[PDB]
Amino acid sequence: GIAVNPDRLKHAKALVEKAIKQKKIFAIHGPYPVIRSCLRSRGWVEKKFTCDLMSRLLRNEDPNFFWTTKRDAVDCRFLKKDQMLNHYAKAGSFTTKVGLCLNLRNLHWFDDADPDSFFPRCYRQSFKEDFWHTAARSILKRVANSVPVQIILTALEACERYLFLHGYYQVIHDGATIEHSEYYVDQCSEVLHKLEAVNPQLDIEGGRNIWIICMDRLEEILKLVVQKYIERPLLIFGTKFDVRQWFLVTDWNPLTIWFYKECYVRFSVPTDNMWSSRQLQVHLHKLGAPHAWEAVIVPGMKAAIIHAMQSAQDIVEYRKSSFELYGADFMFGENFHPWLIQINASPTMAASTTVTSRLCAEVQEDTLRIVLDRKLDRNCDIGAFELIYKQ
Numbered sequence: 001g002i003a004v005n006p007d008r009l010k011h012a013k014a015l016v017e018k019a020i021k022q023k024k025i026f027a028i029h030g031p032y033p034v035i036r037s038c039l040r041s042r043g044w045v046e047k048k049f050t051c052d053l054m055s056r057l058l059r060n061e062d063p064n065f066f067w068t069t070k071r072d073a074v075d076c077r078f079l080k081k082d083q084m085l086n087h088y089a090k091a092g093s094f095t096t097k098v099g100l101c102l103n104l105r106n107l108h109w110f111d112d113a114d115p116d117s118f119f120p121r122c123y124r125q126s127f128k129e130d131f132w133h134t135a136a137r138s139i140l141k142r143v144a145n146s147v148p149v150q151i152i153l154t155a156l157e158a159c160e161r162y163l164f165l166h167g168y169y170q171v172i173h174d175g176a177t178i179e180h181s182e183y184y185v186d187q188c189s190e191v192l193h194k195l196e197a198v199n200p201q202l203d204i205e206g207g208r209n210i211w212i213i214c215m216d217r218l219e220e221i222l223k224l225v226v227q228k229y230i231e232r233p234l235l236i237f238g239t240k241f242d243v244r245q246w247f248l249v250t251d252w253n254p255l256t257i258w259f260y261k262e263c264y265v266r267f268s269v270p271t272d273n274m275w276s277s278r279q280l281q282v283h284l285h286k287l288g289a290p291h292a293w294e295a296v297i298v299p300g301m302k303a304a305i306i307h308a309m310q311s312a313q314d315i316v317e318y319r320k321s322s323f324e325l326y327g328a329d330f331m332f333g334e335n336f337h338p339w340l341i342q343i344n345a346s347p348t349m350a351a352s353t354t355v356t357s358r359l360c361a362e363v364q365e366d367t368l369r370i371v372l373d374r375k376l377d378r379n380c381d382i383g384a385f386e387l388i389y390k391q
Contacts, residue, residue, distance in 0.1 A: 005050075012053040019045035023064040023082070030069030032349065034364045039065070042372065049073075065372075069346065076319055084321045084371065088249075091345035093314040095326075098124065098225045100343065103311040110310045117200040118304045119340050122227040131209060131218050133158055134228075135168045137195065138207040139178075144188040147171055149180045156184070159191050163198070165218065172208055173216075204333045206231020230339060234332040236283060240268040242341060243280075243330045246363055247305050248370060248385065250323040252315055257389040258370060258382075259302055260363055264355050272353035284336070292336035300338035301330055306389050308343055323371050325363070 005011075019025055024044040028036060036046065044065070047058040064083060066074050071087035079085065093099030101122035104115040121130065139155035147167040154164050170176040196202050208216050210229040215221035233240055243265055248258040265275040275283075284292045305328055327347030330338045349364060351357035366383030373380045 008050060008053060012050065012057060016045055016054050016057045019043070020058075020061055025058060025061055025063045026065040026067065027063040028067050029073040030067075032067055032364070034349070034361045035067050035368070038365050038368050042368070071346075076322065079319070079321075081319070082321060084323075085319070086323060086325070086367075087346070088252075088315075088318050088322050088324050090314070092312050092343075094308045094312050094343050095345045097122070097227070097342065099314070100308065100340075101225055101227070103313065104307065106313070107307055107311045111307060113303065113307055114200070115307065118300060118307070118338060120201060120204070120228045120230060122225060124225055127226060128218065128222070130228075131211075132164070133162060134205060134209045135165060137192075137199075137202065137205075138172065138209060139168065140188040140192050140195075141207050142171060143178065143181050143184050144192055146177045146179060149178065151178055152181060152184050152188075156187060156191065159195065163191075163194060168209075169217070200337070201228065203335065204230045204232050204339065230331055230333075232334065233339075234334050234336065236265075236267070237269055241265050241331075243301075243332075243338075244347065245301050245305070245328045245330055246325060246347065247328065247388075248323065248325050248367060249309065250370060251320070252318045254391050255309055255389060256387070257306060257309055258385045259305065259388040260366070261384045261386050262359055262362070264359055272355070274353050274355045276355050276359075289336060296336045297332065297338055301328070302388050304328070304330070304338060304340040308340065309389070310391075323367075325367060 022043070024039075024042070025047055026039050026044050027047050027049050029049045040046070045054050045058065047061065047063050048055045062080070062083065066083065066085045068074060068086065071089070071091070074085055074087070076085050076087070076089060094103055100119075101124065104119050104122075107113060107115045123130070136155040136158040139152060140159060143152055147170055151164065151167040151171065167176070171178060192202075205228055208231055209218075210216045210231055211221060212227045212229050214229055215224075235241075243263050245263045246260040248260070250256045250258065263277045265277075265280050267273040267275070281293050284290075308328075324345065325347065327344040329341040329344070331341055332338055348356075349360040351360060362383060366385050369380065369382040370385055374382065
């Protein structure tokens, strides 16, 4: 004989009626046990897209809150204005490489910030011209640190004008030398020191002129969006890495952006190939760079996110009761300056590792603090989230 709760219908009926009256009905499409538990602890009741009974009783009731993996799960054209959804109608052009490239090209319409200071230069003749000058700067670097001396002559002339390829490929790839290059160590160092002031990508761009399917030869690539490859990124243990930074948009007018003050590193070296935001800060201190995190990295990531949002033009209409969590990928230069690689809609909440299990659970709970709890108390705790922009 198995036990049966004699109050299961009594309790189910009472809790459903209360939830309907208080508009605390939710539905989930996807594996989000954290959202479920967080909402239930807030007194919410679930309607399927004890608990099974209450769902039956909600047969003719519309949910007040939808949490889904993909935006296609709910055609939000037909929601009532008050029904909440964790997606906007469209992801946003910035969630594509081409879109982000096209948007930041017109950043000057919205802010004086130079997009080259946080986004590796991209192209959809200006490309060839840049490839030429990248090769020119590469020679100055190579010399400052067999083809004729003329290769240096044109290179210095080009950089002096801004302020050949056959030889460059031979010097960079073939391993050729440059005649009388010892006479130009000081000239090249001089110009490069000057270029470093007016060219934020001077260091990270490297010297091999690699672009992004990656190609370092102009002819072959031109034969077939093109972005400059970050050849000289910050390395931790000789291995490349990036940072997954979360942010939340809850309104597009005023543009309202919440910044999560916790993130994690992904290694291309722990077994799970990842680090907490806390571990990275310790490593930076070990590098003797106590300024990098607070003064350079975090402010830089915030700015890049804001610039990416405010330069988005493809967003016409949006539901006030909709919101969306985005994931931004950043790499870093040796000077710890962040570089925006891409932006993703609905980042993974998979408990893949010990680091993500904690952070994904927390950002989900903290998201609910913003989209729900703040409606009841404007001064309530919103966890590790921070408002960084409201215009």
